[PDB]
Design a binder for this molecule. Structure first.
Ligand SMILES: *[C@@H]1O[C@H](CO)[C@@H](O[C@@H]2O[C@H](CO)[C@@H](O[C@@H]3O[C@H](CO[C@H]4O[C@H](CO)[C@@H](O)[C@H](O)[C@@H]4O)[C@@H](O)[C@H](O[C@H]4O[C@H](CO)[C@@H](O)[C@H](O)[C@@H]4O)[C@@H]3O)[C@H](O)[C@H]2NC(C)=O)[C@H](O)[C@H]1NC(C)=O
Ligand SMILES: *[C@@H]1O[C@H](CO)[C@@H](O[C@@H]2O[C@H](CO)[C@@H](O[C@@H]3O[C@H](CO[C@H]4O[C@H](CO)[C@@H](O)[C@H](O)[C@@H]4O)[C@@H](O)[C@H](O[C@H]4O[C@H](CO)[C@@H](O)[C@H](O)[C@@H]4O)[C@@H]3O)[C@H](O)[C@H]2NC(C)=O)[C@H](O)[C@H]1NC(C)=O
Ligand SMILES: *[C@@H]1O[C@H](CO)[C@@H](O[C@@H]2O[C@H](CO)[C@@H](O[C@@H]3O[C@H](CO[C@H]4O[C@H](CO)[C@@H](O)[C@H](O)[C@@H]4O)[C@@H](O)[C@H](O[C@H]4O[C@H](CO)[C@@H](O)[C@H](O)[C@@H]4O)[C@@H]3O)[C@H](O)[C@H]2NC(C)=O)[C@H](O)[C@H]1NC(C)=O
Ligand SMILES: *[C@@H]1O[C@H](CO)[C@@H](O[C@@H]2O[C@H](CO)[C@@H](O)[C@H](O)[C@H]2NC(C)=O)[C@H](O)[C@H]1NC(C)=O
Ligand SMILES: *[C@@H]1O[C@H](CO)[C@@H](O[C@@H]2O[C@H](CO)[C@@H](O)[C@H](O)[C@H]2NC(C)=O)[C@H](O)[C@H]1NC(C)=O
Ligand SMILES: *[C@@H]1O[C@H](CO)[C@@H](O)[C@H](O)[C@H]1NC(C)=O
Ligand SMILES: *[C@@H]1O[C@H](CO)[C@@H](O)[C@H](O)[C@H]1NC(C)=O
Ligand SMILES: *[C@@H]1O[C@H](CO)[C@@H](O)[C@H](O)[C@H]1NC(C)=O
Ligand SMILES: *[C@@H]1O[C@H](CO)[C@@H](O)[C@H](O)[C@H]1NC(C)=O
Lengths: 87, 322, 175, 322, 175, 87, 322, 175, 87
């Protein structure tokens, strides 16, 4: 609940940073972690579906947030990057 | 005044003799025998005078790799590494081609003296990890290599150089990645068939990885493979790569000293003992043994016999008669 | 051994010897006695430790070796590593067997040698008075006391006063 | 009544002595000499007490492969496989990398106890053969592998698992195809550069075949390469391949026993003989020999001399004088 | 051998000996004879088979080995396989040359010792009567018959009724 | 003579099985085994040229009948399959 | 007339004795001792009776390849090639996999008897060279291979055969090219990933080269790798290449003879000496040595001791007393 | 050695011996002399050159071998090549040390054997005249001149004209 | 100076041999040896810019004369070939 919204907030401001945009999060519709072969011990991508209320309308999005695990507090933390933000 | 006396010479006999062999016989018994064999074992590994580094659930290759349940072996120079028969590798299962060569070279290095180097990797985000590797809640990884991966949407080629201007040698433990499906190789890097190139002035090494499904070990199926490079004084290493890098964050000091590795299961005690043998560290007062052939320190070698008793005494003549 | 000193003509050792290796038993008019000759065994212990600390430094000083046992079979390099493994062991096991079998054959000949050397030293100190009985134990033909053994055990012993008479009772006059 | 007699001792002499050696001399002769050397050879290979499997026009690698002129070696456990110097391989000439290991591992297995397994290959047609291999009119092939190929117009990827639940090890002798031209590779399979992948939990093997013209051996030019895998108790083997498949139809039982291989040309007789050397099976009543170094059974080893006659006798004194 | 018993002072063996090793030839007033001393040779055969079946079990019990001869040259692993095989052969051939060379040195010393042991046993059974001649063959100085040989061959021989006679003719009275 | 006609009948009735119609064989015009590099010990494809009278007209065909050898009567027999049946 | 005299025996003594070892003691001294060890060295390499080919700035592999500062080793059969510690390789730096095998095989051949053959290479222009290799002003190259390259704008595939109809064996030293960048491989040859194929009736070898940046040695960065083949009597070699070809201009005669190679730095003198050890060619009149373990000729082997003096004499009795 | 001949009972050699090994020193009424017995040493040099050219041909005749020292470490095949090269060296160094130790023990026993062989030959040539003294140097009890030494040095020496004299002065008549 | 003109004369006549026409050299404008990674110990291609007066007009050209070094007078000499002669 808190994790899917936090990465949704990560997805919108990264798009706001890259495009010099300003979009505001509302809520998350669907969060379907892939289970094709493996989702654990490696990349654990969240298929995140988001809708935004910024331009007078609701616009759907799908973000392929490649969440690679870091090594622990001996090294850096808080790993996430947006591969692509399709509309 | 004259009388007849005697001064009959002879030897000593004890009615407790032990059987010994001779080249003109098969079984004869003598008055004294030291067993040149050593088949007994106290069963305690002792940490003096040679420095003994003992794992708890830690193997040597994972000790240098820094297993995130084994972070007490940072530095900690040793003279003998005792792996444990109850071992398990909780960090991203691997396959090491020429595994016996790398383990022998590292065990002969003698010291895990790490030192960082400032590498100018361009276009990468280092410090990746896995979920099997764990230091509690969250994630974890090896603590000595960089799990490189892609950044943004591209993946630039990597040229790096490290001029060894000093007087000591350098070891660079790096790795290749072997994904399971084609989707794993396409997601992590942007190369369908990655290439790695290691070059010094003398020799070179180029590896192309493998793709295929595998049985499950602790999740996923994939493996990584470990390669390495030695740089002489006044030599330069260039690492060129197109994908699938696990690039090191420093160089391990070599040393031309005296150190080995061993496999046993005995625990750790306090003694002053020089010969260390798996399944019991035995003292070296005899020049032969019948315990296991693996051996570190100045203590004897294997002989398949059981009773090689050298006669520190003469032949038994039991006290005939009653 | 090859000289036949021990187990060639002596058929019983003794139990009272606890302080030495080559005893000097005797039967005199002053009573049965027992006195271990210190110098004769001291050479023998010096000789037998002369080979013992020789073989004490027979340990391999190898601080790094190759794999000596395996949990997987791979064939050609595995068999060659096992062949070098195995052929080292028999060459060392034979050498250990050739060590011990010579050194007992040495020692029984070694311990036989001072038995014959003490035979000759007891002979050559008399050479007319210590006539052998063949049982590996001598026979002195003159009157003998505690001054006998305390002299013969050490190096000093005159063969000029006792030479005279021990030749008298080596002879039986006919008539 | 007294007289002077004699009891002169001495020893025995024979005027047919044989020369021996000593460490203080070079050539001395004695009264008796047993030849510890064994240079003679009866020339007959005997089939008892060791079970001896003898080929006629058959070799061991082609015996396991089941050459279709040697189909009497189905099962037929052995103790010593004697190949024949007049051998020839009539079935699809092959090139195995690492030949000495596979021949040594199989000869140490000791038994050809085959057993089929139910493999669910999908999208393939098995049971392919060649024309050099022949059992009379028609065609033929090896009798222990499946010459896999394409079906219809496609070639699906293959995933096959075999859970070794039992308490014995498993051998899976498989192969890869090395075509001559690109037309051969693109017709049998639909892959220009096929890939094979063999995976257990411990290790993995990935092979990419070679393409090129070759000299003619009995027709065509092509070759096949033989590979293999060993499965431990409680281990699962996964075979993945994209093309160039020769996949096995069963697992060969291992055995940690006592069996060897040897090359000679002597025929088969009936004896009770324990030692077998090539070019004559000789008895073992002497500790040394001078016949060929290859040896199966408890019988002596090679020394390079010719007359090491141990003196079971005293030094010869010829009867001086006339 | 090193004792010098055989080929040191005996210059000829004999041909009638077919039933033993260490014969007992003699010349008496009852005729020339030849009788094998059974106990002396039997220990020597016991010793020489004590080493013979020792070396009978010197066969390699290998049921699987490495390649021993080759029809192709490939270099480093080929040379190492050839080097391990070759250096095994010299070490075994030097050992086999060494192993033989001690046992003839052992055997010539054993028959050297067994003749000397027979010499001493013939000496120590008399010790005043069997005065040596140096030719490797003795000389008994009393009257002797077939009862001589049948006693000396066995372990029993009294040296009290013949001791008083053979010292008579070892001495020549002057006058 | 008999082998080429038998393979022609195999090609035509395998084709008839595949597309669910009916064609009838008449005769074989040309049977040219390939001799580029090797035709023996392996695949021995027969370039078979056929004509049929099924729609009341003569239509030429070329069948690349991939005749891979089987192992002998120890295993299965009668191997043939049609790679492609061009008109 | 009678007197008492003496004939007191004994032996000989000198007051200059040398210490020796015994198995029952540690250090006893004798009246005479020869040093079975040979630790001395005259320091001169002599060229008789063994034919010694000595370089000046030339190594053996570059002598085979014809370094263009060493063109006096054309033919010139030898018995022991002495490389120089001050060596350098002025011609196109290389990397030969299994370098120890090729150097050992050639040094066992014993003779550099070259012979050209009429090779019908089609569509190539041979005789390429480099600027590091120099015989004065201009260019230069190895003098025994063909640096093949493209012609016009294409590179046709190559099929060549050489029927060995004669009774001797044939060796063909050829090579692969490892460029630095992708532009180097695309300019010289017209293949992004070139392929070679060497095939006899017995065996085959297929190599795919590597691409990558390397440290500079004398210019460029690139390397070539040397491969080889052996042809038996009545055998046919077929060489097939798609790119990266360095093909030979003839075959080297083999010889099953007696020849070695050595590494030292001593100059050349005139003697009649049979034993040649590095760091001094010593005479062989002793059964042991202590100079380096590398050895050519019938002269003894390394023993790690220093004074193994065999007693050619008796135990020393110094002349007691004063 | 094991016979105790050299340095068991002879405490000093001599410096005038430059032409031989086993000298024959003496003191007579004609003056002190020194004469090296040629036949005794000549057999001894034949014996020790018997083992010398035996070990002279103990060199390796290898015309091509494997790499013996390395300038790079590569692991498994490197360690096996080093292990085989090491284990050859300890086996040969042991075999060298065993050979030097055995032949030194042989040579001290060999000259130990020749001394007793010279002792017994000097004994058995007299056997009633050369009564020992135990100092490793004999004592001849009859009148002696330069004809003594020139006979005893060679093989010919009569023991019938000198036997009747040396038994006289071993006897001391009581009265 | 002499080398660039000689290769230009080599460039025109090896061109002229191929299409069966006739062009005449005038002078060389620019001769820029490449220095991207390495120009020495290997191919030393000269970017040669030439202008000719053959049709009565000046026409620019660029020849990538791949001058691979030969082995010395033990083997052949004078190596040069025209990869492409663009106008
Ligand atoms: C090519 O072929 C290989 C054949 O090896 C396939 O590999 C197998 O893949 C499957 C799934 O893809 C694996 O199945 C998994 O097994 C895990 C371990 O099994 C334990 O748990 C089960 C209970 O389910 C016990 O019966 C068993 O004895 C073991 O103790 C399971 O953990 C997996 O998930 C199950 O458990 C979790 C627990 O949280 C549940 O949440 C799940 O819902 C589920 O119930 C799963 O079942 C199988 O193990 C693999 N083989 C091997 C040898 O490991 C490849 O997948 C195939 N390739 C392709 C592309 O298909
Ligand atoms: C690349 O280069 C290689 C070079 O090795 C080529 O390989 C050769 O290929 C040719 C054909 O392509 C082979 O030639 C064949 O030889 C067979 C065996 O020869 C025996 O018989 C002949 C009689 O012709 C004897 O003279 C000879 O001594 C042998 O005893 C022949 O059997 C072949 O057919 C001939 O005989 C049959 C018999 O029924 C007739 O029907 C035929 O009409 C014909 O007369 C044929 O001649 C040659 O053997 C191959 N080399 C080797 C070493 O084997 C590659 O072909 C080439 N690649 C390409 C693509 O061209
Ligand atoms: C990937 O990363 C590798 C890292 O190794 C790069 O390789 C380096 O490449 C550069 C050039 O690309 C090389 O630099 C050259 O060094 C030569 C040797 O240096 C000597 O001379 C200099 C004097 O300049 C001394 O200071 C030094 O100590 C050496 O003694 C120079 O000769 C080169 O040219 C210089 O000298 C000539 C002399 O005539 C002048 O004409 C030039 O103008 C210039 O001054 C040049 O500087 C460097 O050596 C390479 N590294 C190594 C370890 O050798 C790869 O280039 C890189 N890949 C890519 C695609 O960039
Ligand atoms: C020869 O080998 C075959 C295997 O190829 C044997 O067949 C199997 O034998 C085992 C042993 O009892 C059975 O458990 C299997 O059920 C058999 N499988 C099949 C498919 O038959 C065969 O029994 C062996 N012996 C003979 C005489 O053929
Ligand atoms: C040096 O080697 C060359 C080979 O490169 C020799 O040339 C061949 O020699 C053999 C031996 O007689 C002849 O059969 C060949 O016909 C020669 N071939 C050629 C092309 O010349 C050469 O003779 C050798 N010796 C010298 C002095 O050059
Ligand atoms: C100690 O354990 C090992 C198992 O690795 C065994 O082989 C060995 O025999 C044991 N020691 C003794 C003295 O039995
Ligand atoms: C030993 O010699 C005897 C008699 O010469 C002979 O009968 C016997 O066979 C010999 N022993 C052998 C040859 O082993
Ligand atoms: C038997 O034949 C082999 C050939 O493989 C030969 O080397 C060997 O010498 C022969 N045996 C004898 C006793 O000569
Ligand atoms: C000769 O030089 C070598 C160096 O290669 C050295 O190892 C050896 O000890 C030297 N020789 C002597 C007798 O010191």
């Amino acid at each position: 609940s808190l994790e899917i919204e936090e990465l949704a907030r990560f997805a919108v401001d990264e798009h706001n940073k890259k495009e010099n945009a300003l979009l505001e999060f509302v809520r998350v519709v669907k969060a379907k972690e892939q289970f094709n072969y493996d989702q654990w011990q490696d990349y654990t991508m969240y298929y995140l579906t988001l809708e935004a209320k910024d331009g007078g309308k609701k616009k759907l999005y799908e973000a392929k947030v490649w969440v690679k695990f870091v090594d622990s507090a001996f090294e850096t933390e808080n790993f996430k990057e947006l591969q692509e933000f399709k509309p | 005044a004259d009388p007849g006396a005697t001064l009959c010479l002879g030897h000593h006999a004890v009615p407790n003799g032990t059987l010994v062999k001779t080249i003109t016989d098969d079984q004869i018994e003598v008055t004294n025998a030291t067993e040149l064999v050593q088949s007994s074992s106290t069963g305690k590994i002792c940490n003096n005078p040679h420095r003994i580094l003992d794992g708890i659930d830690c193997t040597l290759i994972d000790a240098l790799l820094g297993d995130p349940h084994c972070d007490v072996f940072q530095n900690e120079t040793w003279d003998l590494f005792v792996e444990r028969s109850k071992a398990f590798s909780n960090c991203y299962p691997y396959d090491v081609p020429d595994y016996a060569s790398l383990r022998s070279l590292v065990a002969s290095s003698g010291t895990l003296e790490f030192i960082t180097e400032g590498f100018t990797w361009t276009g990468v985000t280092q410090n990746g990890g896995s979920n099997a590797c764990k230091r509690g809640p969250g994630s974890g990884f090896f603590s000595r290599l960089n799990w490189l991966t892609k950044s943004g949407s591209t993946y630039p080629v990597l040229n790096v150089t490290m001029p060894n201007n000093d007087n000591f040698d350098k070891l660079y433990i790096w790795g290749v990645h072997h994904p399971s499906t084609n989707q794993e190789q396409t997601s992590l890097y942007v190369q369908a068939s990655g290439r790695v190139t290691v070059s010094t002035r003398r020799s070179q090494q180029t590896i192309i990885p493998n793709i295929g499904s595998r049985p499950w070990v602790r999740g996923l199926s994939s493996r990584i493979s470990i390669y390495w490079t030695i740089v002489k004084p006044g030599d330069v290493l260039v690492i060129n790569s197109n994908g699938n890098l696990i690039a090191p964050r420093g160089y391990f000091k070599m040393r031309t000293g005296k150190s080995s590795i061993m496999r046993s299961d005995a625990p750790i005690d306090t003694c002053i003992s020089e010969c260390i043998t798996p399944n019991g560290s035995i003292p070296n007062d005899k020049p032969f043994q019948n315990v296991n052939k693996i051996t570190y320190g100045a203590c004897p070698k294997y002989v398949k016999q059981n009773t090689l008793k050298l006669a520190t005494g003469m032949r038994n003549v039991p006290e005939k008669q009653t | 051994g090859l000289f036949g000193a021990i187990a060639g003509f002596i058929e019983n050792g003794w139990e009272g010897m606890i302080d030495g290796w080559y005893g000097f038993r005797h039967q005199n008019s002053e009573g049965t006695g027992q006195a271990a000759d210190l110098k004769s065994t001291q050479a023998a212990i010096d000789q037998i430790n002369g080979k013992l600390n020789r073989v004490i430094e027979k340990t391999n000083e190898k601080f790094h070796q190759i794999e000596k046992e395996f949990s997987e079979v791979e064939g050609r390099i595995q068999d060659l590593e096992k062949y070098v493994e195995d052929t080292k062991i028999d060459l060392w096991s034979y050498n250990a067997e050739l060590l011990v079998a010579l050194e007992n054959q040495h020692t029984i000949d070694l311990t036989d040698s001072e038995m014959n050397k003490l035979f000759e030293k007891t002979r050559r100190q008399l050479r007319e008075n210590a006539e052998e009985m063949g049982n590996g134990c001598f026979k002195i033909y003159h009157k003998c006391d505690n001054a006998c053994i305390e002299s013969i055990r050490n190096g000093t012993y005159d063969h000029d006063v006792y030479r005279d008479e021990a030749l008298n009772n080596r002879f039986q006059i006919k008539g």
